[PDB]
């Protein structure tokens, strides 16, 4: 039976990979950073409170100018805000109300949406007339869309619930490349600053790093014990953080191909919805199911502070490009900016 | 403030009033989720998910069929927390067919749906179909193949009563949700009338609990 031989070879390869990972481990980052100054205490206040949504907020994104942001909600609306003055620039009504992801184009021209309808839509903001119209409706997935991100004005990358991630061409409208190899639903995506690689985290408790040009999987990280819900890169493009339902964030390194540090407290028994970094990566923000956010020290694994004030589950948060503010969205239909 | 700033504030106020009007219009709809394991004909017609909109006696309905979403439920069930009710369809003549037993699988799915943590106060509408075929074929095969411990009369009415009891006796915490049962037909829009009655009862309870007197 060739199946038994293939399984034995795969087990041998996994054992060799584990042995190499163990041999590559010399010292721990905790031991290295045990002699660094701790962050004292962080007390941010709600500078702004954006209102106007009528249902649970599922996603949000920041503009490159660090002033304009887009929000997605289950009432079939897509609002672009002015963070400084709490003004609304646009209100886009969608065809399907079951939206679960949103993106803002790096050029500021287009926006995107997706959800349970298997179709990723694209909208055009700057037109000769005074309204926003649909420019394209991409189809070709079999399960729901979880995450969508822009590479340029002509390329988009999406992740689906049928164990596949695809790269699309907006002008043509067809799938240029399809990445396969997962086992369960894919939930989160994150793009590197060089825009040449990206990582995905699925429900089989695994992490996969892809290459856009070649179209293949490079490395596999397996440390978790349950579902994985969120991903986010380190600014330098050599590490990323993961959120899971076992009440544990984790940090992985691309060069060492091993798990570095874990975060866990005996008072945390909930899940993790969103994870983001600061500009320098010293402070790590994670949204929890217990109605408030936690600020973690990325180099000493200590609890710096708590950003409380949300009356329901926080499902999304992000930091500006200049590191000047953060904004958290929650199921209580509110957005708050903290400085 | 300058001229352009004042004009921007005016635009924002217009957007506000449009959003408020849209929300006020949309708050008065009835949302239903359709599930099954069993034939959606006469219940949905009479990729992704399918919308279905209709009006019956001055009420706007939205029926969502999610039969084509073959993925892990536990990661998109929570979108349907605020649905008004659930419609559940069961085949009544699949007791003697192996996929395990079809009706055993139906019971397992019903238990998992009813004992979910997001549906502690959601009414369940139960439709049983193919009653004519079940009555035709009840005489040629006994009921011991599925439930060995029946020990009773082998007639259509008794079998239907036993099945209804078996399906109604699986709701733990039977203090916050009510399960309705019906035998489907094809005359006088009786199915739509039944759905209308169920949603009317649920709406009355929800208004009572929202006004804070119960």
């Amino acid at each position, epitope marked *: 039976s060739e199946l038994d031989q293939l399984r034995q070879e795969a087990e041998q390869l996994k054992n060799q990979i584990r042995d190499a990972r163990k041999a590559c481990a010399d010292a721990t980052l905790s031991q290295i950073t045990n002699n660094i100054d701790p962050v004292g205490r962080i007390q941010m206040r709600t500078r702004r409170t954006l209102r106007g949504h009528l249902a649970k907020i599922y996603a949000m994104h920041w503009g490159t100018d660090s002033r304009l942001l887009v929000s997605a909600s289950q009432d079939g609306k897509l609002i672009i805000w002015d963070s400084y003055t709490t003004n609304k620039v646009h209100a886009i009504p969608l065809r399907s109300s079951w939206v679960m992801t949103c993106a803002y184009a790096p050029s500021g021209n287009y926006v995107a949406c997706g959800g349970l309808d298997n179709i990723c839509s694209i909208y055009n903001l700057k037109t000769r007339e005074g309204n926003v119209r649909v420019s394209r409706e991409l189809a070709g997935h079999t399960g729901y869309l979880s995450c969508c991100r822009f590479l340029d004005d002509n390329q988009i990358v999406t992740s689906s619930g049928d164990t596949t991630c695809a790269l699309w061409d907006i002008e043509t409208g067809q799938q240029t490349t399809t990445f396969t190899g997962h086992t369960g639903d894919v939930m989160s995506l994150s793009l590197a600053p060089d825009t040449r690689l990206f990582v995905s985290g699925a429900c089989d408790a695994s992490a996969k790093l892809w290459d856009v040009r070649e179209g293949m999987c490079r490395q596999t990280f397996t440390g978790h014990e349950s579902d994985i819900n969120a991903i986010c890169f380190f600014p330098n493009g050599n590490a990323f953080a993961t959120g899971s339902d076992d009440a544990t964030c984790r940090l992985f390194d691309l060069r060492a191909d091993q798990e570095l540090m874990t975060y866990s407290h005996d008072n945390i028994i909930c899940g993790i919805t969103s994870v983001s970094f600061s500009k320098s990566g010293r402070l790590l923000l994670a949204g929890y199911d217990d109605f408030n956010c936690n600020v973690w020290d990325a180099l000493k694994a200590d609890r710096a502070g708590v950003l409380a004030g949300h009356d329901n589950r926080v499902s999304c948060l992000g930091v500006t490009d200049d590191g000047m503010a953060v904004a958290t969205g929650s199921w209580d239909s509110f957005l708050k900016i903290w400085n | 403030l*300058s001229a352009e*700033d004042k004009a921007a504030v005016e635009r924002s106020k217009m957007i506000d009033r449009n959003l408020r009007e849209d929300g006020e219009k949309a708050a008065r709809e009835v949302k239903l989720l359709l599930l099954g394991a069993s034939g959606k004909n006469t219940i949905v017609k009479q990729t992704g998910i399918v919308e279905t909109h209709f009006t019956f006696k001055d009420l706007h309905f939205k029926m969502f069929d999610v039969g084509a979403q073959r993925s892990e439920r536990k990661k998109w069930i929570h979108c349907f927390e605020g649905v008004t009710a659930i419609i559940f369809c069961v085949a009544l003549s699949d007791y003697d067919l192996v996929l395990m037993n079809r009706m055993h699988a139906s019971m397992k799915l019903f238990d998992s749906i009813c004992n979910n943590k997001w549906f502690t106060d959601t009414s369940i509408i139960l439709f049983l179909n193919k009653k004519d075929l079940f009555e035709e074929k009840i005489k040629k095969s006994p009921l011991t193949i599925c439930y060995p411990e029946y020990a009773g009369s082998n007639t259509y009415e008794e079998a239907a009563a036993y099945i209804q009891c078996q399906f109604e006796d699986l709701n733990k915490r039977k203090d916050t949700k009510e399960i309705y049962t019906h035998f489907t037909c094809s005359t006088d829009t009786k199915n739509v009338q039944f759905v209308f009655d169920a949603v009317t009862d649920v709406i009355i309870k929800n208004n009572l609990k929202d006004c804070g007197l119960f």
Partner: single-chain antibody, 232 residues
Framework: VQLVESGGGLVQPGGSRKLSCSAS????????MHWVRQAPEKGLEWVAY????????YYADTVKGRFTISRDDPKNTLFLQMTSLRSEDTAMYYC??????????????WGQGTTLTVSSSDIVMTQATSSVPVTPGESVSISCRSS???????????LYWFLQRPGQSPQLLIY???NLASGVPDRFSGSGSGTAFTLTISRLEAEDVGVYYC?????????FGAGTKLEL
């Protein structure tokens, strides 16, 4: 996207006439509409303004009390009621659209123009340059001045540019400092600070002949300047 103006004619003093304009090719209801007239041999003068939602109506001192402005969104038609005519009303009337949000470009499009002949605390904008000859392939500079500095506390400067081709409606070139509108070649640049303004044309072509204009948008008397004429 086009604007057509209708009406006009010859009215004796003491009479009345109602100008009308029609629009097609864009979302009319979400725009604010202006009125601008031009004397037979003089510059451009601002008359009235109506906003989207009909919530803001601004007039001019010379025409206050004798003019009325209104719009009809369902019919895509604009009006300007006009009573108690005088001998200074002889001009050619225009119609301009304007939209306001963060990053928008007001005054982007211009109408055609109709002629009406009748038988018989304001910022001063100064631009003394006029009748300057031009040569193809050479750089040309146009200056402009104002009494009050145009730099607001929010970091903005509210100044505009317009180009009057021979026998044609004005075209918007630059709407604010260091900003080029759609359809403008990348050889027109505008810079300055405070009360000093300039416009740079690196290589002027044959279509670069006409009259240029300044405009302010700080508060709401609206003032233009005696245009600078460039001829080959």
């Amino acid at each position: 996207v086009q604007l057509v103006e209708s009406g006009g004619g010859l009215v004796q003093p003491g009479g009345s006439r109602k100008l009308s304009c029609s629009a097609s090719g864009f979302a009319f209801s979400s725009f604010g509409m202006h009125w601008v007239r031009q004397a037979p041999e003089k510059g451009l003068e601002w008359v009235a303004y109506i906003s989207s939602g009909s919530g803001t109506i601004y007039y001019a001192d010379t025409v206050k009390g004798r003019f009325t402005i209104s719009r009809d969104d369902p019919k895509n038609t604009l009006f300007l009621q006009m009573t108690s005519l005088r001998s200074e009303d002889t001009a050619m009337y225009y119609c301009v659209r304007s939209i306001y949000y963060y990053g928008s470009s007001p005054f982007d499009f211009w109408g055609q123009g109709t002629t009406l002949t009748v038988s018989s605390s304001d910022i001063v904008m100064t631009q003394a340059t006029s009748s300057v000859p031009v040569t193809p392939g050479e750089s040309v500079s146009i200056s402009c001045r104002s009494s009050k500095s145009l730099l607001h506390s929010n970091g903005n400067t509210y100044l505009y540019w317009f180009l009057q081709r021979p026998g044609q409606s004005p075209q918007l070139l630059i709407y604010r400092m260091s900003n080029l509108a759609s359809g403008v070649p990348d050889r027109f640049s505008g810079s300055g600070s405070g009360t000093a303004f300039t416009l740079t044309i690196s290589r002027l072509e044959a279509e670069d002949v006409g009259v240029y204009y300044c405009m302010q948008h700080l508060e709401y008397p609206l003032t233009f300047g005696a245009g600078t004429k460039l001829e080959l």
